[PDB]
Design a binder for these strands. Structure first.
Ligand code: GSU
Length: 529
RNA sequence: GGGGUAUCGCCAAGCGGUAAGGCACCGGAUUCUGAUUCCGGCAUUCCGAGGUUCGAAUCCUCGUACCCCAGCCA
């Protein structure tokens, strides 16, 4: 429960409403991030919890910043998260004609006029946060001139920035938004939905209140930066002929430590090629997390946990991670994989090999079991063998022994180093019938694998607050390793996650895995204390 | 100037009866994953200072900190 849901309960009870109708209205000017997920869960979640409706509307009022690839990727993300919208997908562009007609109604009521102040003068005439603005010398044109001048704008008779439509309100309002807000501006750009039919586009504030109203929206839910906008929102609907007046509510926007959360900054990371793309596994985008291995249910869980309030906040990576660990720990089948391999021979072993059974899930037999190949030449992680080490070290130590996961107990005996003195192969002996603990892979049956370990994109908690956030990127946000996995992973499918015992949760695709050389992304490491 | 928010490290309930929960953390028990699971601990105070009240984090007052607004962006 959150304040907004309680308001809804109140509205329902009092009969003010009989159905709830929300909307998710992103601008297709980039991909969606975990923040947008919070909005998606909120808006669609309320819809299904109350048997209401949630529309998917592309707020496409600015052609030069938008692209068809973005709308495509957005429908994709919303669908992947697990939500369905009301009827067809909607586009603000579907209302250009309506918007144009409503602009004409305002002009007719003397509430709007064509201003010819340059883009620099409008700022000069706007006043400041502490000084009132001043009326434009064109503010009192007659209905007829405005009507004529507006038509010229629509017809392309004005070069960009030479004219625009403004609402006639109050140049001396403490709300800078009421200082004669621009309704329409000229843009000779092609629109991904309307082609070149328009050379004038409606602004956000004008478009949104009308789109919500025509769509029958009952609760327009957005973020805190739009609180000031509410006054203009109500002003517009109050002055045009439209039957419904949706109520607005603002919640705080999500912030995650060690990353940025604005399409503008994320896009910069894409354009300057510092990440592979919007869906790079290190990105806080929804598609990036998906490729990283997060489940749509783990994201819905996270959104549910962080809550919806009016307080500024920055969640910790640990929280998001706990969500993904909870899911995978329960559903991900276990497998063996060695990231930093070192040859280990069991001089004691006779033959070409045998087969040992391993649980597909240690704490869940119902998830079945599988046959895994064991032999005399195996790979173990270079970090699980110490010639000495303290008393805490519970792994392989020269002279001492360790249990091979779901297999035999081996005793390190003789080690062998190379030129620079690095160990090349560890010699051990195994007990006839013996079935800490370390994982392993039979060298002979091992599947060569590329393992991509990921880490926080940035070095600091709040990279957004840095002068040059790019200069604070973590050089080790991605580190690639070549290792060995049990033959079993030969069937691994993209997106599907596995737990590589004693390491973490991994998944395929990564956009790079082939048939010859598979690529696994570390979604997240195991809780290691 | 206007609009907002201040409750345990990070989130977050609480709407006058006198501090939920999650994440994190600290112990202990399990365990062929130093994982998981499982017990136990963790704000005598709710930005601060007065005030109304039998009693407030929840009502009032004066403060203080932080966030958003001066795109023909959204
Ligand atoms: N970090 C964050 N945390 C949580 N919610 C966030 C968010 N960033 C954006 N949002 C919300 O996502 C929705 C779409 O984002 S967006 O594509 O930028 N488009 C817009 O903001 C505007 N076209 C919508 C205006 C409105 O809804 O009043 C918008 O509704 C916006 O409020």
């Amino acid at each position: 429960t959150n304040f907004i849901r309680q308001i809804i309960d109140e509205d329902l009870a009092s009969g003010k409403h009989t159905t709830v109708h929300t909307r998710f209205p992103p601008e297709p000017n980039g991909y969606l991030h975990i923040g947008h997920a919070k909005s998606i869960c909120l808006n669609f979640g309320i819809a299904q919890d109350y048997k209401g409706q949630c529309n998917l509307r592309f707020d496409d009022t600015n052609p030069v910043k938008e692209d068809i690839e973005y709308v495509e990727s957005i429908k994709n993300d919303v669908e992947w998260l697990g939500f369905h919208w009301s009827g067809n997908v909607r586009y603000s562009s579907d209302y250009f004609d309506q918007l144009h007609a409503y602009a004409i109604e305002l002009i007719n009521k003397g509430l709007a006029y064509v201003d010819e102040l340059t883009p620099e003068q409008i700022r000069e005439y706007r006043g400041t946060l502490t000084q009132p603005g001043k009326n434009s010398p064109y503010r009192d044109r007659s209905v007829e001139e405005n009507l004529a001048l507006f038509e010229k704008m629509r017809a392309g008779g004005f070069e960009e920035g030479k004219a625009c439509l403004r609402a006639k309100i109050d140049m001396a309002s403490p709300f800078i938004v009421m200082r004669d807000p621009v309704l329409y501006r000229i843009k000779f750009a092609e629109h991904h939905q309307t082609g070149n039919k328009w050379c004038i586009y409606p602004m956000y504030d004008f478009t949104h209140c009308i789109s919500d109203a025509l769509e029958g929206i009952t609760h327009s839910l957005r973020t805190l930066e739009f609180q000031d906008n509410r006054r203009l929102y109500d002003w517009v609907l109050d002055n045009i002929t439209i039957p419904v007046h949706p109520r607005q509510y603002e919640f705080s926007r999500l912030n995650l430590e060690y990353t940025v959360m604005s399409k503008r900054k994320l896009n910069l990371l894409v354009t300057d090629k510092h990440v592979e793309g919007w869906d790079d596994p290190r990105m806080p985008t929804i598609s990036g997390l998906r490729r990283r291995g997060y489940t749509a249910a783990s994201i819905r869980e996270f959104c549910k946990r962080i809550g919806v309030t009016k307080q500024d906040n920055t969640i910790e990576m640990a929280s998001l991670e706990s969500c993904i660990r909870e899911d995978l720990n329960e559903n991900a089948p276990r497998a063996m994989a060695v990231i930093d391999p070192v040859k280990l021979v069991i001089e004691n072993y006779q033959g070409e090999g045998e087969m040992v059974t391993m649980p597909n899930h240690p704490n869940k037999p119902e998830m079945g079991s599988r046959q895994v190949p064991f032999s005399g030449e195996i790979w173990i992680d270079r970090a699980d063998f110490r010639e000495e080490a303290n008393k805490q070290y519970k792994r392989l130590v020269l002279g001492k022994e360790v249990r091979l996961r779901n297999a035999y107990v081996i005793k390190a005996e003789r080690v062998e180093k190379d030129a620079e003195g690095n160990i090349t192969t560890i010699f051990c002996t195994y007990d006839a019938d013996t079935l800490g603990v370390i994982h392993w892979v039979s060298a002979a049956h091992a599947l060569p694998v590329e393992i991509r370990l990921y880490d926080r994109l940035f070095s600091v908690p709040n990279p957004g607050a840095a002068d040059d956030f790019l200069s604070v990127i973590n050089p080790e946000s991605l580190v690639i390793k070549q290792g060995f996995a049990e033959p079993s992973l030969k069937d691994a499918v993209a997106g599907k996650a596995f737990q590589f015992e004693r390491e973490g949760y991994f998944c395929l695709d990564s956009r790079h895995s082939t048939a010859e050389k598979p690529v696994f992304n570390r979604t997240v490491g195991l809780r290691d204390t």
